[PDB]
Design a binder for this molecule. Structure first.
Ligand SMILES: CCCCCCCCCC(=O)SCCNC(=O)CCNC(=O)[C@H](O)C(C)(C)COP(=O)(O)OP(=O)(O)OC[C@H]1O[C@@H](n2cnc3c(N)ncnc32)[C@H](O)[C@@H]1OP(=O)(O)O
Ligand SMILES: *[C@@H]1O[C@H](CO)[C@@H](O)[C@H](O)[C@H]1NC(C)=O
Ligand SMILES: *[C@@H]1O[C@H](CO)[C@@H](O)[C@H](O)[C@H]1N
Ligand SMILES: *[C@H]1O[C@H](CO)[C@@H](O)[C@H](O)[C@@H]1O
Lengths: 7, 323
């Protein structure tokens, strides 16, 4: 991780 | 201005050029960007629960179209790129890149200005959808939480979770008590509500959790009748059954996860992707040595112990039917 989304 | 000049002035990486071209083509919004100033800005920041220290700094640093032309160009078009998707949960959450902190307080708080400039538009959407004012405001208060988190994590004022605030600002996410729910769809397009848990608001007590769940269908069926979700979906470090090794029966997470049906496969033990998620949410981790992290709570001790053991934490995905 450490990023996010949601795509 | 041209996007290449903006990029260079702001110190933005070459990779952001595509985005800036997008924004160049989109152009300025029909309704020109208006930043609140002075006591108006202080009143709004306070309504959004931004800590006093940060709010004072935000008001002080507010940028100007003439002195900050590259930043202003980006602010206008970033705001536009959000409101163009008002109500639209099928659009990706693109809030734009963070600005290098060499640009000072205006750069650090850039996405706060984006959020402030966009409050009128989303509140108009709230009204159009018949959303109660107190729900609208309660939703938007996560700005203050995210601002406070930036300072805890990095030591100075900022807000670098602009991808997440695109949900609030497009009117697709609502805080209904302790939990938030977003309009969402599965891969096959089936509507559901995405569940999230904001940090502020105290422990995830079962009664508070239960109340929020009871609010979900009536709220969305009233204001977004076209959606028609029957289930809530969550992906979280909190759904990892490995927590059961470490947390006791009085744990809110343990009690409430028992209601969830996990829909992903048991992850590979060597998969380390979920480590950064649990470290962000438990510690707001910023690369420091694991020994240096606090150990006051059972969860804090648990995260580190498990990692020290050579083991990994996993985001897990599941659902609960909406009552
Ligand atoms: C579980 C059912 C929900 C499943 C759906 C998941 C979809 C959600 C998608 C997301 O939003 S992922 C991000 C979720 N949000 C966060 O992680 C926000 C930051 N976390 C928190 O604020 C708390 O972790 C939270 C309010 C969510 C829960 O706290 P609780 O206190 O209710 O949890 P619990 O009762 O299980 O805690 C057990 C122990 O760990 C401690 N603890 C819990 N969260 C902690 C934390 N975040 N940092 C340090 N300690 C923490 C807690 O104080 C307690 O310490 P002691 O046993 O020593 O008394
Ligand atoms: C993230 O997007 C995916 C698919 O669009 C969806 O399944 C999930 O619920 C979304 N998350 C939120 C919080 O809306
Ligand atoms: C995903 O990340 C968001 C930003 O940290 C957070 O607000 C949300 O609770 C989580 N599901
Ligand atoms: C998922 O993939 C998208 C591109 O489709 C990225 O923008 C995102 O950062 C994540 O890696």
């Amino acid at each position: 991780x450490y990023x996010x989304x949601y795509x | 201005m041209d996007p290449e000049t903006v990029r260079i002035a702001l110190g933005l990486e070459e990779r952001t050029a595509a985005w800036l071209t997008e924004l160049d083509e989109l152009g300025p919004p029909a309704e020109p960007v208006r930043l609140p100033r002075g006591e108006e800005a202080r009143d709004l920041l306070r309504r959004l629960e931004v800590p006093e220290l940060d709010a004072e700094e935000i008001v002080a640093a507010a940028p100007d179209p003439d002195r900050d032309p590259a930043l202003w160009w980006l602010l206008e078009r970033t705001h536009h790129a959000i409101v163009r998707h008002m109500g639209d949960h099928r659009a990706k959450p693109r809030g734009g890149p963070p600005l290098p902190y060499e640009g000072g307080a205006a750069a650090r708080y850039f996405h706060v200005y984006v959020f402030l400039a966009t409050v009128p538009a989303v509140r108009r959407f709230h009204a159009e959808r018949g959303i109660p004012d107190e729900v609208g405001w309660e939703t938007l208060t996560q700005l203050g939480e995210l601002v406070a988190i930036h300072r805890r994590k990095y030591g100075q004022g900022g807000m670098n979770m602009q991808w997440w605030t695109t949900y609030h600002l497009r009117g697709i996410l609502y805080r209904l008590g302790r939990l938030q729910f977003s309009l969402a769809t599965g891969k096959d397009g089936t509507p559901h509500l995405g569940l999230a848990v904001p940090e502020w608001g105290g422990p995830l007590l079962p009664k508070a959790y239960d109340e929020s769940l009871h609010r979900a269908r009536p709220f969305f069926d009233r204001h977004f009748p076209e959606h028609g979700a029957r289930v809530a979906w969550g992906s979280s470090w909190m759904l990892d059954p490995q927590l059961e090794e470490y947390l006791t029966e009085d744990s809110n997470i343990i009690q409430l996860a028992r209601f969830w049906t996990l829909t992903d496969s048991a992850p590979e033990p060597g998969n380390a992707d979920g480590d950064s998620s649990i470290l962000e949410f438990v510690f707001r981790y910023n690369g420091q040595p694991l020994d240096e992290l606090p150990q006051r709570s059972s969860l804090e001790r648990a995260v580190i112990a498990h990692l020290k053991a050579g083991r990994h934490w996993h985001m897990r995905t599941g659902f609960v039917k909406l009552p």
